[PDB]
């Protein structure tokens, strides 16, 4: 399985904090297992995860991810390199990074995290062949965002 | 030789026009006016602000981001003249557009064109 | 008049203090356009890119004059503590598409 | 001691009178010579000399092949030509020490026939845009009234000269937006960097009034830096590195994208080709044709000259012929009279070869154009 | 041709530097700018004073004074260059020295140097 | 485009060093570089363009055929060269409007290394002469303190200029005699129309002492407007159009007429051989040799290019040798150290070719030296 | 001013009237160097060889601005009516050490 | 015998004016009979004759006859063609011209009037071969004067 440990700290995340709704989904475990999230450019979540990270992270990251109050998620650039990956992005929410950016175990549950970051994803403006958190089937059926 | 031909780079002489570092430079090689490679001339202003240009290194298969500087402040040398255009987009993506003077930021506010400098600021894609 | 320069050239980002105020600079952008800050606090560009940025600040902005910041290179710094209070906004000087913002309440 | 045709017989000619002169006995009595009325045959050619401190601007009658005038200049000046010929002006920039020192940009207005400056317009701070020069980087409203030209730093702006008044009124706040194509005495659409079209009507005072078009070309299409426009039909045709072209009419006051059309043949592409060269794209009004230097290059090299000319209907994107230029030409431009002349410039040889547009026939040349002649210009009259 | 050689006066083109009234000139011939032989072109400043030279026509075999007076207040023509020296002396004899910018006595005090023209002002010996 | 053999060698050095620093990661960071001190070998090629408004001056290092630096100019500049290498400067003139407008004379000195300009010093009512580039038309006194230059209308007259204290101080009304060649801070030496020589001497105030020397050449022996003057040696050298050499010896602040000496031999002026060129002698100090450029021509063919200089002992007038430069040369010079080196400028060929004075062999060359190069100027250390 | 000019472009000699004041002009030289004349006299030189020659006086000699006398080419005559007394200096244009003057009692 | 006319009014040239002392001289003879002037280039002669100009001429007419008060007497062109001949200028000194120019009958006889002309056409510059008051001998001995 994958290595979830803080990006800053590098201390283990512990997994005992993680609200006890939502730790049991498909995806939840799937990620956990393979490290990779199911709800990736998912028709039947996005338009809930966009909602979530409308009220939840808009109010810093921008309408769209590409910055304001706080930095961009929308591009190739990432301050924590391993934020290229879930497996880094989830560790990100999860145990928190400086500053207004702390862990986001008590707000969200394991499975909201996955889908807001299903969202974060859908936002990216990059190119396709970039997109590395993404099968061949997905880059395949991605396009770059625009409002 | 065939001006249409594709540019065809070499890493043994600064002041011919095929010389890789030149793959996106428009006027006049400085090393011919009594600047360097990197540097100005006596008396020019160098700016700091420029169009760059992700030029590849034949003698070690890499490439890298040049940015070329204009030394300002002085008429065209008018020695060693070269127009190369590798990635070079029109004027409305400034950033690659080398048809612009780009002599922004040099001291005294020197806006005419004399030579540019072909610097490495980074490896490129 | 309305800010300050604490390195007049840019330095290693290296030397960037930890949890210091930054707003790195990449994909031919200020990942973070409207930073909002408060009087005192010092603010710190970072480039990230081999594409060389910088900021700039027309005339009455930050004073009489305009201030045309220096060109970061890949991984350099470039800091402005602004002193007075209010909205100041920035651009990158070979790149007018480039805009930024540093709100000082 | 190199002589065109042309001017070896005007020199001949010249040589005849002269001669009979004397003999006659005439005598002679220097004076200040006068330039013919200006005509649709008339040629300008801009040398920026390779981005000098200095530039000149030749005036010549295509028709003769000789150059009638001339017109001094800054640093990379913008040119501009009343269509009806009534007058001609540029947009310079001078130092108080050739190339250092105080900098002064202007607008001169001179009189067609005489060249004599009749009006000297300061521009305030140096506002113009130091590039290479592009026709519509400095253009004149429909009118002949107004003057307007570009600036890239601080920020993106197009300043309003006042000719009439013979003088400067104010800078325009304008998007990330490149070119200025005036329509109306108050109103010029730019390019801009997101792939659209921008209207800006603008009036004495205030903020100009701007709207945006559909974007109307991918992000991985570019445009080349020298588009043709015709004022009075109200036509922009706009090639890119591929030879694809974008028309936009205007003549309804509002962006109005046409059919795209490809200049080049679906052979041709194949076969490398592609348009390269400074003022690649040329279209006549009445004929409403295209006119396009190409030639089989690889796909970076979109700078250098061109030995073919390649000639389409700009309606049906048909291809009405090909011609073999036989030079490596820079620009290229036409008269815009019924039979028009197809104007191809060489900088390389400081050289404005003049052909039939038709045939595509060398008719006669004019060379010693400066030391890097690269922008042709002609009035459409009538 | 050879530059040294005798120069040889022909009558049959202007815009030649062998062209007879041309035999002391220095710079330009106007009639490649806009003038005539013996006419500024347009914009351009009429001098009054000016060197000279006694140039033989090989058309009627007599030989007339020619006076060299420049056109100015514009750079250069740049256009049909000729220096020829028939009888030109140092500048310590002005009156036949074609080195000296002869603008003196044009309009506006144009001192610049553009072309110039071969008039006739009269027989010689 | 062309490299000389002395260019590609410059280049690749360039490129070995530049791909070292790369390999050593050593990160590129331009600044504006300063140009090698002053010596011996450092030669000053001015261009005058062809009477173009604006000129250019090349400083290159002799030794390595190298351009170390550059100083722009304006209509006809008069240049000059401190022997001590303490500084250079010159005389211009620009206009408000490129070659209309207000005229506006002026001296400019500069420094040696940075070539910064440290002084610009306005010289009132347009006083310089405007002509063909003669060296001594602009000299500078012994101290290096006073710039003295000639005014040919409305009447002879020189202006001192006070570099020291970077200001105009008068103007000198002078017979007519023309050139200037100082022998002290307050003493220079004038050609006259009437063959004589004048001698003036200046204080700070009032009419200047003014003596004829006596008429050392016949009214039909012309004296070419490039004579070589040491002023170290306070020797003149004079040739004639025939390639008779007049010396005149201003050591001991008098003028004293050396025996005359013919440069060409009675042979060569039997074949046609003649002097020819713009910069037609050099003179060698310290070896006391004269160079002149010769060439069969026709008599009135004194302008154009040779291909030969010849040396000789200027004391006995004794043939020392006759080079074939291989190339169309219109002025020469020579470095006044040890073994010196013969510089011969080709105005046709933009180009300057660097030979051993000795041998009298090409050892580099430099070329894309503008657009008419016409002057050399070396400066006398030590 | 000191002088008027009677015609402003050179004329034709032959038409200066016999007894008329003089002063020729040939073999490069003001045949009469030192002219004495009363004021109101006019005087009216004349060019006797092919070389042009005109007359001209320095600013502030004959008024405020200086005359630069039109060039009389062979045969050609140039006059000027001296209305105050005085000596006024003058030269030929293209030809300094050519000079002359006025002399107006 | 040539006609002796007053240069300017055509009135002849009344002799009865001329002093009575020097009229008999072989030259006088020989120059109203032949209209030649025996005194010109002739060494014996040139001494007292430019001394006769100088205490008669040069106040007006320049050192060297260049010019000054009076038209220049020492080139080819003459105000008054006549001028160009012995008889001609024998009648502007005798008869006078216009102006300061008068008669000089009274304070030169007629000897000295024909030597003070030997040395005006003395001071002549022009080529010898133009001396057209000169005759053989004294042309190819007669060098253009030079102060
Ligand atoms: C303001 C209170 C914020 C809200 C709401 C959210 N984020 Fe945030 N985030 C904020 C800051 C100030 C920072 C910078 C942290 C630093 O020290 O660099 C961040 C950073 C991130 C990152 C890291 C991206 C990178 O540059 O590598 C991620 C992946 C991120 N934030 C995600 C995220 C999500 C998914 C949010 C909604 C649930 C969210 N943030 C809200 C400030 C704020
Ligand atoms: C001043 C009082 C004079 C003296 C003494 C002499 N001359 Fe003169 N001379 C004078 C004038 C003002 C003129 C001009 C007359 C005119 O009508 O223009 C002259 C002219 C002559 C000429 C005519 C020359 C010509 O160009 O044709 C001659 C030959 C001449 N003068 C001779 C002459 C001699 C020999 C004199 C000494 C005895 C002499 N002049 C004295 C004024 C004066
Ligand atoms: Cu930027
Ligand atoms: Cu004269
Ligand atoms: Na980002
Ligand atoms: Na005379």
């Known amino acids: 399985a994958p290595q979830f440990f803080n990006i800053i700290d590098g201390s283990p995340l512990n997994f005992d904090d993680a609200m006890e709704e939502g730790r049991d989904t498909e995806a939840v475990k799937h990620f956990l297992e393979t490290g990779e999230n199911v709800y990736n450019e998912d028709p039947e979540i996005l338009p809930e995860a966009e909602e979530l990270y409308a009220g939840m992270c808009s109010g810093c990251h921008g309408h769209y991810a590409e910055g304001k109050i706080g930095p961009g998620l929308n591009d190739a650039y990432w301050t924590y390199p391993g934020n290229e990956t879930d497996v880094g992005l989830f560790s990100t929410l999860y145990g928190g990074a400086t500053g207004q950016m702390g862990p986001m175990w008590g707000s969200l549950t394991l499975d909201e995290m996955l889908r807001t970051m299903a969202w974060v994803r859908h936002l990216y403006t990059g190119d396709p062949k970039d997109a590395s958190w993404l099968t061949d089937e997905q880059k395949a059926g991605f396009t770059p965002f625009q409002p | ?125 | 008049d309305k800010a300050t320069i604490p390195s007049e050239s840019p330095f290693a980002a290296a030397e960037v203090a930890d949890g210091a105020i930054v707003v790195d600079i990449a994909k031919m952008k200020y990942e973070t356009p409207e930073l909002h800050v408060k009087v005192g606090d010092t603010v710190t560009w970072i480039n990230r890119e081999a594409m060389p940025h910088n900021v700039h600040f027309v005339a009455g902005v930050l004073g009489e004059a305009a201030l045309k910041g220096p060109m970061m290179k890949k991984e350099q710094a470039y800091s402005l503590t602004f002193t007075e209070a209010g909205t100041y906004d920035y651009h990158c000087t070979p790149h007018p598409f480039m805009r930024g913002k540093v709100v000082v309440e | 001691e190199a002589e065109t045709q042309a001017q070896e017989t005007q020199g001949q000619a010249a040589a005849r009178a002269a001669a009979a002169d004397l003999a006659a006995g005439q005598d002679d009595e220097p004076r200040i010579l006068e330039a013919p009325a200006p005509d649709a045959r008339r040629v300008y050619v801009n040398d920026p000399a390779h981005a000098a401190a200095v530039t000149q601007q030749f005036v010549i009658d295509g028709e003769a092949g000789r150059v009638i005038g001339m017109i001094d200049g800054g640093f990379l000046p913008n040119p501009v030509v009343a269509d009806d010929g009534s007058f001609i002006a540029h947009a310079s920039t001078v130092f108080s020490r050739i190339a250092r020192g105080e900098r002064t940009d202007y607008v001169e207005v001179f009189d067609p026939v005489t060249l004599l400056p009749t009006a000297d317009i300061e521009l305030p701070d140096a506002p113009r845009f130091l590039v290479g020069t592009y026709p519509w980087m400095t253009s004149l409203t429909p009118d002949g009234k107004t003057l307007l030209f570009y600036q890239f730093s601080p920020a993106p702006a197009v300043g309003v000269v006042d000719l009439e008044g013979k003088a400067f009124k104010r800078m325009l706040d304008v998007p990330d937006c490149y070119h200025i194509f005036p329509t109306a005495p108050d109103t010029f659409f730019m390019h801009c960097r997101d792939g659209s079209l921008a209207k800006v009507a603008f009036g004495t005072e205030g903020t100009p009034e701007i709207t945006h078009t559909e974007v109307f070309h991918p992000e991985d299409e570019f445009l080349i830096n020298h588009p043709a426009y015709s004022q009075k039909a109200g036509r922009l045709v706009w090639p890119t590195y591929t030879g694809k072209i974008h028309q936009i009419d205007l003549s309804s006051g509002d962006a109005k994208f046409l059919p795209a059309v490809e200049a080049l043949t679906e052979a041709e592409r194949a076969d490398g080709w592609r348009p390269g060269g400074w003022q690649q794209v040329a279209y006549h009004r009445a004929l409403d044709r295209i006119y396009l230097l190409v030639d089989q290059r690889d796909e970076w090299r979109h700078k250098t000259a061109s030995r073919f000319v390649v000639v389409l209907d700009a309606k049906t994107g048909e291809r009405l012929a090909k011609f073999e230029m036989g030079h490596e030409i820079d620009s290229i431009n036409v008269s815009q009279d019924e039979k028009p002349l197809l104007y191809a410039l060489s900088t390389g040889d400081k050289t404005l070869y003049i052909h039939d547009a038709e045939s595509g026939e060398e008719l006669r040349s004019v060379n010693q154009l400066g030391h890097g002649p690269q922008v042709i210009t002609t009035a459409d009259m009538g």
Chains 1, 8 share one sequence.
């Open chain 2, 1 to 125: 030789t065939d001006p249409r031909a594709k540019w065809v780079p070499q890493d043994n002489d600064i002041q011919a026009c095929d010389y890789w570092r030149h793959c996106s430079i428009d006027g006049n090689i400085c090393d011919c006016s009594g600047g360097s490679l990197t540097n100005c001339p006596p008396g020019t202003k160098l700016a700091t602000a420029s169009w760059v240009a992700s030029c590849y290194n034949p003698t070690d298969g890499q490439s890298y981001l040049i940015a070329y500087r204009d030394c300002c402040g002085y008429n065209v040398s008018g020695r060693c003249p070269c127009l190369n255009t590798e990635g070079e987009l029109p004027v409305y993506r400034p950033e690659f557009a080398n048809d612009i003077i780009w002599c922004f930021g040099a001291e005294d506010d020197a806006m005419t064109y004399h030579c540019t400098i072909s610097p490495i600021v980074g490896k490129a894609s």
